Amino acid sequence: PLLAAPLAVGDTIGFFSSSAPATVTAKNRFFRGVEFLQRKGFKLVSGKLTGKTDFYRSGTIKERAQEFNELVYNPDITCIMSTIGGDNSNSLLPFLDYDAIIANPKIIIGYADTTALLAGIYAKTGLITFYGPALIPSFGEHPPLVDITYESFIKILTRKQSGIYTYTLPEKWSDESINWNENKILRPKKLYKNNCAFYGSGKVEGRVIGGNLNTLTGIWGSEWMPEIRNGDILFIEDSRKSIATVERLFSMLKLNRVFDKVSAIILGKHELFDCAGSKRRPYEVLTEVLDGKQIPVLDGFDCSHTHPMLTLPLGVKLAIDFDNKNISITEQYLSTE
Amino acid sequence: PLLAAPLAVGDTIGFFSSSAPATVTAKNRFFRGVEFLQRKGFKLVSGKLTGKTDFYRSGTIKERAQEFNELVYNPDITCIMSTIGGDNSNSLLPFLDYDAIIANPKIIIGYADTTALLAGIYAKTGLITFYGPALIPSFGEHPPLVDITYESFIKILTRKQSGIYTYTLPEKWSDESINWNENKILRPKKLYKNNCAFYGSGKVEGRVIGGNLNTLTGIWGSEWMPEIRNGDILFIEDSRKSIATVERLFSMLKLNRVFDKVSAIILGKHELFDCAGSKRRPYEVLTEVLDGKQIPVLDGFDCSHTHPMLTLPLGVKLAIDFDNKNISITEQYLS
Lengths: 337, 335
Ligand SMILES: N[C@@H](CCC(=O)O)C(=O)NS(=O)(=O)OC[C@H]1O[C@@H](n2cnc3c(=O)[nH]cnc32)[C@H](O)[C@@H]1O
Ligand SMILES: N[C@@H](CCC(=O)O)C(=O)NS(=O)(=O)OC[C@H]1O[C@@H](n2cnc3c(=O)[nH]cnc32)[C@H](O)[C@@H]1O
Fold this sequence. Notes:
The structure is a homodimer.
Chain A: E1 12-16, H1 22-25, H2 27-39, E2 43-46, H3 61-72, E3 77-82, H4 98-103, E4 107-110, H5 115-125, E5 130-131, H6 135-139, H7 145-158, E6 165-166, E7 172-173, E8 192-193, E9 197-199, E10 203-212, H8 213-216, E11 233-237, H9 243-255, H10 258-261, E12 264-268, H11 282-290, E13 297-301, E14 312-313, E15 317-321, E16 326-329
Parallel strand pairs in A: 1-2, 1-3, 3-4, 4-5, 10-11, 11-12, 12-13
Antiparallel strand pairs in A: 5-14, 6-16, 7-8, 9-13, 10-15, 15-16
The complex binds 5'-O-(L-alpha-glutamylsulfamoyl)inosine (2 copies).
The site of one 5'-O-(L-alpha-glutamylsulfamoyl)inosine (1EI) has 16 residues of chain A, from helix 8.
Domain LD-carboxypeptidase C-terminal (chain A): 205-319
GO molecular function, one term (chain A): hydrolase activity
Domain LD-carboxypeptidase N-terminal (chain A): 13-132
């Protein structure tokens, strides 16, 4: 795979708004996230659509593609970070400068709707991109959870690329929709014990592919959807969906023969899942859809819309040890220097 | 293509609930639809999940597939009609009895989420199915709009298959969200003059393919999504979406090279579209996404979630005459 140079303290991070204009609509949280990273020593470059609005988005399709490309062209930038997702980053894909991305590999990071870009860039260039923090939702989060998000971000992106990396398990997590865009919290979020579950036995190792599942529907079938192959580990997460929608998306995967190929599935914790009174969780729905197909599942990985969020390279090998209840990166995912 | 026998007054219609359990949650409207069709002379057979609930759906994936299959096996049924959509009919696709459908073709009709079944059945069997009324939303509608829906349903499904069929244009329509499952009429729905527009010139003729666009995402990429081919007319409609979602779905089509293949696009009227204060309509968003590609578009065809609803065969040739502002079926679609 094509690898970006690693991050280091003091580096320059550029940020872009490929969909929702949250630098305007969540400006307090945006400023808190900016200050958070600056205090860590990072220099920030603001994408050209910062502070702009076109109703539901930051600008036209072409304006948004230009904003992103301009960060790729900047030789001082080590990391290109999404401000926030939305719905519309898939529109940009025909207009990204893939040749420039290949010539100037950088760490590209975000989540949610930005999956369309992470997956599309990988499909076109082979660059290992990252499912991880976006500036506003992730780094504008109030303590204590933001510190745990940051610890994973800095560990994954700055560590020496020698030997496997085994993920830590956050002690507590939350998905509450409070404390969004004001100076002070209303009240502390509920902190849940980590209820991640490992369904299966033994160890499965394979290339991880995926992201936000609902977002993948916007690139599915196209040259921008990475081909899923025998032995891959599928990583999928969704946010604020009804159980009805979750069944639909799992059945989409089934119809596409994905469950005939993959050797394991990672479900990210689902933010504020709506079970419609059934008390069912997503894993139970997946089990029905699987129709007897035995695939081991890591249910509740902390790489999703819940807080805190771990950073995950996409398109490299992971090993899930179902017996020891852990998950590791086993393939180099950044340049050694 | 594989063609079903035409409908006749007095035939038996069977109904099924492949997703939302609205025979329970919209029972008043359900009864209105049943009574409406019975008064027209039809006999109705209730699918086995009628009156059942499993929270957000009518039953398990397998039981829903069985409900549908049992209607296919019933020799008395000439039309299989959806009760209502939802989100989940794509789940049934591995379990439908496609061989039985081929062996005794019937009229299969519905819309919205049921697109997954209409499209999947066509992909597997070549059967010409119908984007059209579902029992509860369509035939449980109060007069006067229900009468216009019915007029199209009966015309399309009973007419002799000789010469082209040119659609009538409903004079007025509505998408107002009132008088759903209430027993009394607060008042008639607000009625709007028909604002359908023909963007283009000349005449375009090609096989129509599509349905509810959001629903197509649940079958996309699979063997159940019919291949879109050079010359097709793409028919798409959506309901109650944000402009953000509409842009995403149009861009999905673009990324899939759909706009390099199609000869025209039909946009169904979009029920209660949310433009996020932009004042933009779906056609304007499509125009941006097309990035200069000159595809003629019929914007606002009355085959969608708005009332009244026309009945449209899928998988046969239509001719859109942009100069004369009309649309016709030009290929035989019933036996
Ligand atoms: N959720 C996907 C869209 C795709 C999908 O959901 O299927 C997305 O792109 N989200 S996003 O724009 O990046 O938002 C990221 C996070 O930001 C959170 N968020 C956004 N606005 C608000 C808010 O007003 N209050 C609380 N939380 C908010 C939201 O709960 C989500 O977890
Ligand atoms: N909307 C698609 C799903 C595809 C999608 O929208 O992404 C669908 O399957 N719809 S449906 O379950 O068949 O609903 C059909 C119609 O039923 C109407 N409806 C349902 N419940 C209500 C209600 O409570 N009030 C008013 N109208 C309602 C609504 O206007 C919609 O047009």
